[PDB]
């Protein structure tokens, strides 16, 4: 039976995008059932008493250099902006994550593509992801029709959508999250929580699967 | 010619031990010149304004679980004691790092083994590494004679040894360190600083070498 792997992420998290692309490349290679869980990193940080690593000068500088190298190693078009702290702390990703939650509730088959497009806007093209038109553009590029995207956008402020995002974020905390991304592997009645996009080789080991690098063949 | 790769470490750092063993396993496989750089993590922490991650409850908990899994994946006999905080924040590793600095100055050929034995005491058997007799035990187990070990131990308080440790620690800070371990690769004019024991696959990519996992064919 395929092992269930849960990935908690926020589009505001560049490292979550990296982990997400690696798991998506392996979802049809490894015997796993990938379940995407849109969460709010702000909620996780507040609950754990943690703070964004970029607030400390040297860590912020390191992130920039690290992401620059990972762009080539992982072959993910990430272009980290110099004013990333403003993007993270001043703008945020509330509407975007509420939108992805609505997508997960009514059109889950579109969640992977819709998520990738939002990440592409904020961390690849340095485009806005807080305004309605911005989210609509991302949704349409993901394949949704103007009508579908519009219908979902109208529900981002409904109690059902808000409560679902809150619950998913709380589930991450219950697993012990202090940041994102976190991957939860359910292997033979055992649950393992791994933090970071750099624990995938360890995940392979736990699953008894073969690690073939961040870019597996075929 | 072989590419110079510098590894900055402190025996007080368990992750530094994991990074160290991986590089030691590859030092004769990849075209590199591994340079060990004994450093003080406390000095790096103070200089960067960072704090031990284990101080945050949820992260301290994660570290324990992470190291337990890495133990089997990397095949390193690491046993994280319940009171790791006391060993770190309280006891420290000053004398031990000054000792290794002395070893590096007069018996460089013994640095690798001396370093490993000290890690074995603190992170494997959970034994003391602050008292001279504790350090002597490690040095002798590493292959040094009581005469040699005793000789180096008498120099850990000399200005030459103190300044060398300070300078090496400062070099790590100048490279942008906010913690350990950090690996600095010198590849064709360019200098890349990588943080963590989990960036070794990326290092292989930068060096144009082949990554064969944490345990390459012996
Ligand atoms: N070395 C790991 C780091 C992940 C990370 O720093 N995640 C940030 C969020 S970032 O994507 O905005 C995070 O949640 N950090 C928590 C912490 O560092 O305590 C990796 O390669 O994925
Ligand atoms: N995911 C990396 C973490 C290294 C780490 O947390 N290092 C601590 C010291 S620990 O060995 O005592 C450190 O210096 N952390 C700095 C920070 O987390 O900001 C790995 O797998 O090596």
Curated annotation (Swiss-Prot), chains A, B:
This is Glutathione S-transferase kappa 1. Homodimer. The modification N6-acetyllysine is found at residues 68, 82, 113, 155, 162, 166. It catalyses: RX + glutathione = an S-substituted glutathione + a halide anion + H(+). Glutathione S-transferase that catalyzes the conjugation of glutathione to exogenous and endogenous compounds. Significant glutathione conjugating activity is found only with the model substrate, 1-chloro-2,4-dinitrobenzene (CDNB). It is found in: Peroxisome. Belongs to the GST superfamily. Kappa family. One of its GO terms (biological process) is epithelial cell differentiation. The modification N6-succinyllysine is found at residues 46, 113, 141, 155. GO terms for molecular function: glutathione peroxidase activity; glutathione transferase activity. Keywords: Acetylation, Peroxisome, Transferase. Glutathione binds at residues 13-15, 50, 180, 197-198. The keyword Heme does not apply. It comes from Homo sapiens (Human). Ubiquitous. InterPro entries: DSBA-like_thioredoxin_dom, GST_Kappa/NadH, GSTK, HCCAis_GSTk, Thioredoxin-like_sf.
């Amino acid at each position: 039976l395929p092992r269930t792997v849960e990935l908690f992420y926020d589009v505001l998290s560049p490292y979550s995008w990296l982990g997400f692309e690696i798991l998506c490349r392996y979802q049809n290679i490894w015997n796993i059932n990938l379940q995407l869980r849109p969460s709010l990193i702000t909620g996780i940080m507040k609950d754990s008493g943690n703070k964004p690593p970029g607030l400390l000068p040297r860590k912020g500088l390191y992130m920039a250099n690290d992401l620059k190298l990972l762009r080539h190693h992982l072959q993910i078009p990430i272009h980290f902006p110099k004013d990333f702290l403003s993007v993270m702390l001043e703008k945020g990703s509330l509407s975007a994550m509420r939108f992805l939650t609505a997508v997960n509730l009514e059109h889950p088959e579109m969640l992977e593509k819709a998520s990738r497009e939002l990440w592409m806007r904020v961390w690849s093209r340095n485009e806005d992801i807080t305004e309605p038109q911005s989210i609509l553009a991302a949704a349409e590029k993901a394949g949704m029709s103007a009508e579908q995207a519009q219908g979902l956008l109208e529900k981002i402020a409904t109690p059902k959508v808000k409560n679902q995002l809150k619950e998913t974020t709380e589930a991450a905390c219950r697993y012990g999250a202090f940041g994102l991304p976190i991957t939860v592997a359910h292997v033979d009645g055992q649950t393992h929580m791994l933090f970071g996009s750099d624990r995938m080789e360890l995940l392979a080991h736990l699953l008894g699967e073969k690690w073939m690098g961040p870019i597996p063949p075929a």
